[PDB]
Design a protein around this ligand. Structure first.
Ligand code: FAD
Ligand code: FAD
Lengths: 607, 607
């Protein structure tokens, strides 16, 4: 089969046996989608991923897109376009889309589980397919007139882009200088050069592309607050009929050559620089740009995290399958005997250490993003968590930089163990892991760098939140800890929780002391990422231990066969994660408790 | 011009820290004084940064092309031109024995010289390793073979180490390639080898010496039954060197790799094309694995030095970028959207990252130069006061560190180099992504990290009765025991030293328990790589601390300007490493003290 190895079994286990998302299925908003249909949906997109979607994974990397300066367009390899047609023909770009736009209603937890398969098999395919979802965001933010245009864009499956970054403005979005000039007829002319725009052109995949463009109206103030969001289509079109008209002045001028994710066209995009204006329409006919744009950013951050987790999962399973077949060496209990029987490398302790490390972090990360997704629907959050809409939103916002930052960083690091498991053959393009590594390196960078995620997590999602979302999560961990076979795990989780509370308190002190000693805030920065990673480790450990508790109940009730093996691995992974990952948080707390500004006072020249 | 060298740090180590200048101008090194040594470094650094580095990108983007009908490789012109610059300067004869054309010099200086080639275009050094292998052949050869080795070295023949088969990588002793003795005393070699570096190399050289492991007919199993053979690509006149008829050793494939693409990695068929692969028994004795390990020890030294060289230019690139990239306001002014924009070196996380790159890069540089100072009996005596036997044992202990810890650390920290560039880090326009790809294999060839860790524990500690390890620990204890401007660092090093001693005792106890319950030996394997990495952290922190002590004395004495900045940076690095890296070893010790065989007893089906 393909490079892509899916894990529907683990998804369903999470959705049903752990979090109880089936308990909203079949009723009210989900009245026409039951537990059986949901599972059949996941099996169906998994087969599509493993089949036609994954089939062009290698081709997209080896035969990447080409920019044509003679038409300012991009050409995509034929095999990949065939994969995109499979994705559209099955309607998959419209699941979790609102019903009035043609979508099938469902819990966000099920939606992201479905998308995992596309991100595992060929992640750029999903990125090119994000158009209808951005049309929906345009709808929810648009005037009534604009809501008709967005409906046309979704129904016709136009592509879309998120257009923020400029050469001098990436992390600092508010430094952007792309300009908006209001016209007598109420439209705007956008003038600027944007950089690194994913899917800014898409060959002939779609009949139009909606660029959602941040730009500074003439006379507006500085920073992100001065920005507005504009609907800037690639082609003008009839506002009632949708018929495609003349070309608008928004042109790709280059495509970047990248380490990976090569089949995703990453483009420099010029607005109003080629002799015709880039006409835009103020979204909502209100000036509220960064706020509107962050509806898009939040989705993109969820997607990047889920992508990284999807890639590690298929990386692990590839590594595992390889280890099961590769004969090399004697059993360590016979290491001195040179006539001893050769064994498969799963018999070797370092390999099992490596595989269990890969397994626990992949499964722990899947649990994290599905858990994050159970707070993205007010009604799921009520039904499975007992929390109201306001708390749910804050808990989701707390968890997003974890999915994104902890997910991106952990997936790329643990794929190293996946490649290591293949020995020298892991360094070959013949196997998919080296491409997994190159494709996933970008996950720590776009949709906001790990450092930006760590800062949002602490400053905005904890401090500004007054700790409500964090206090909720920590309280759920504490309950699990208070409650036999899982006593050691609970004791280790107790230590990890205290360690994370200690780190939170040290950083809070550094921040609060900045009122009387400005440079104190630097210690917050020095510690932020390690703190984010620690909370990620804590969540992984908790959720795996929760999985183990369910697995114990299921084995006690008589699980057999393949089910019994699955449950047994949950117990093993949870125990291994508690005994091998969690204790390091203690040293990390002590390190964060002793941070100082020596590294900040050093002359730049001494580096 | 990707390659950024650091001759200043090399000289600082060679002379101010380790005192290699003490043997320069005396006995074996009479014609090389400290001035000439310094000029040799500056000279090859200039060559590396210019002509050698010039084809780094070309070799990746335009990799060798294989003709299966001729069984040859075509290399890209720009890269062959870099190879000619290397040869025209005599840099394929560094540290070669004087009677082969070499300039005598301590191994510490030679490896420092090679560092620049490995940083600039590592595959160029690999192609140029022929003369060094000729010298190894010389040392192991008969008087008549010594004459062939003299010819090969003088004519600049390339060379290969030929061990790996599809079914024998880590387990060298499972090799099935056969050697068939002929009545005249030559042998015919028959078999297929795999992953052979430089098995063909275009027209770079007039011949290749293949050093081939093969099993004489009827010999026993395992590594002890293997013999080592001289198998030239071309037959040649043993008196004049004149090249004769093609010998029966043909490249039949060339791998497609994630990185190091300009290095032809080849399937090599001996005696499969109707032409015998004639081989000559090295030293006309049956001692193959012992003989070949002279080669493996150089290769492991080279791979480590490669990883380290690449991280260093990785970091120096990241630092130069950070110094000129403006993004965001200072953290003391985050709230103010009017604040001045700053260069990213002002941000805590970036300074954390740069100092992590710096401390590991410079700590590793110190490790490999430290290791080299035990590689000459005369340098070890003059610099350390140790006899030749202890010197060899210490060098043997440190090589899996250089290789295993060097390779794993360099690859991991390059991730920070790439992150410093933000999204541009993901572009091929900058060299970091190729550093990552090129260096991923350093954890794999010349023995995987797990084989390094197994070698370290069982052979370089247990079979050594702890003597070399006890020597190094004693030196560390001496530094700790002896101003109190470094009291905190010495206290942290004291905890780390005891942590590592604790780990060694635990693993030793698991081994001893294996006399009673064989399965206990699995715990050694589970912990071996973490122990290797611990010792590497201990050495890094100790050597950085020694560097800081030197820098303090030199600052106290009145260093100004660029010297002052350099010395300040060493103090900041030693302090940062002790406070941010070393404490984690306490958690690692506690994890190793609680290893258990659960993960070993788990059904393979539960993964
Ligand atoms: C493949 C790819 C696709 C992309 N697609 C899109 C797209 O469709 N739309 C779009 O708008 N953008 C897109 N981007 C842009 C991407 O989001 C930016 O590259 C990213 O936000 C980082 O910005 P930058 O490259 O300017 O790096 P910089 O902001 O210059 O950051 C460089 C370094 O400085 C650090 N840093 C910066 N500011 C701070 C701070 N305040 N505190 C601490 N550290 C800091 C960063 O962490 C990083 O280590 C894409 C990028 C890539 C690589
Ligand atoms: C670019 C490149 C160039 C190379 N050039 C050469 C060359 O010129 N000459 C040459 O002779 N070889 C060469 N090699 C071969 C290289 O040395 C081998 O790939 C390496 O020794 C690992 O062997 P393997 O690929 O068969 O992996 P395997 O031996 O099959 O190992 C796969 C996995 O099992 C683990 N494992 C295996 N045995 C054990 C054990 N006993 N205990 C614990 N874990 C174990 C490994 O650590 C790894 O994680 C090259 C390899 C590459 C990638």
């Amino acid at each position: 089969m393909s490079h892509y190895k899916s894990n529907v079994r683990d998804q369903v286990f999470n959705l049903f046996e752990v979090f109880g998302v089936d308990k909203v299925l079949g009723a009210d908003k989900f009245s026409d989608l039951d537990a059986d249909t949901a599972r059949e949906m996941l099996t169906e997109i998994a087969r599509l991923a493993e089949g036609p979607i994954a089939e062009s994974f290698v081709e997209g990397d080896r035969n990447p897109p080409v920019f044509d300066p003679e038409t300012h367009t991009v050409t995509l390899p034929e095999g990949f376009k065939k994969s995109m047609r499979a994705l559209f023909d099955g309607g998959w770009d419209k699941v979790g889309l609102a019903e009035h736009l043609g979508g099938i209603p469902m819990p966000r937890a099920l939606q992201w589980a479905l998308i995992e398969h596309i991100l595992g098999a060929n992640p750029a395919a999903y990125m090119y397919a994000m158009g209808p979802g951005m049309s929906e965001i345009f709808y929810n933010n648009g005037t009534d007139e604009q809501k008709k245009w967005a409906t046309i864009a979704a129904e016709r499956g136009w592509g879309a882009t998120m257009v923020l970054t400029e050469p001098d403005a990436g992390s600092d979005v508010g430094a952007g200088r792309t300009k908006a000039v209001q016209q007598p007829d109420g439209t705007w002319h956008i003038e600027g050069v944007k950089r690194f725009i994913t899917s800014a052109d898409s060959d002939d995949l779609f009949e139009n592309i909606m660029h959602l463009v941040l730009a500074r109206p003439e006379g507006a103030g500085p920073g992100t607050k001065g920005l507005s969001l504009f609907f800037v289509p690639k082609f003008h079109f009839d506002h009632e009929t949708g018929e495609i008209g003349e070309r608008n002045g928004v042109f790709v001028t280059n495509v970047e050559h990248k380490m990976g994710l090569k089949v995703s066209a990453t483009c420099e995009l010029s607005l109003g620089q080629h002799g015709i204006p880039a006409v835009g329409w103020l979204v909502g006919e209100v000036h509220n740009g960064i706020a509107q744009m962050f509806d898009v950013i939040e989705q993109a951050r969820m997607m990047v995290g889920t992508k990284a987790i999807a890639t590690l999962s298929t990386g692990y399973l590839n590594a595992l399958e390889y280890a099961k077949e590769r004969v090399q060496g004697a059993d360590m209990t016979q290491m001195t005997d040179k006539t001893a029987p050769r064994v498969t490398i799963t018999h070797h302790p370092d390999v099992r250490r490596s595989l269990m490390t890969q397994k626990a972090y992949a499964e722990g990360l899947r649990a994290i993003y599905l858990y994050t997704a159970t707070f993205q629907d007010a009604e799921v959050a009520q039904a499975v968590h007992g929390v109201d809409g306001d708390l749910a939103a804050r808990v989701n916002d707390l968890l997003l930089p974890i999915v994104k930052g902890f997910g991106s960083e952990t997936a790329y690091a643990k794929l190293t163990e996946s490649l290591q498991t293949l020995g020298g053959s892991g360094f070959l393009q013949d196997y998919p892991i080296e491409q997994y590594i190159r494709d996933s390196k970008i996950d720590s960078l776009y949709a906001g760098t790990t450092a930006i995620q760590a800062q949002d997590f602490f400053f905005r999602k904890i401090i500004r939140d007054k700790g409500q979302a964090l206090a909720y999560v920590a309280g759920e961990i504490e309950q699990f800890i208070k409650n036999g076979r899982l006593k050691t795990e609970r004791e280790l989780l107790a230590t990890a929780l205290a360690d994370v509370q200690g780190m939170a308190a040290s950083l809070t002190g550094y921040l609060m002391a900045a009122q009387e000693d400005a440079a104190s805030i630097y210690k917050v920065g020095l510690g932020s990422v390690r703190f984010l990673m620690a909370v990620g480790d804590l969540l992984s450990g908790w959720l795996l231990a929760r999985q183990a508790a369910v697995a114990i109940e299921k084995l006690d009730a008589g699980a057999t066969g393949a089910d019994k093996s699955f449950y047994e691995g949950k117990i093993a992974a949870a125990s291994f994660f508690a005994k091998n990952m969690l204790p390091l948080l203690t040293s990390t707390r002590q390190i964060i408790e002793n941070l100082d500004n020596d590294v900040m006072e050093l002359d730049e020249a001494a580096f």
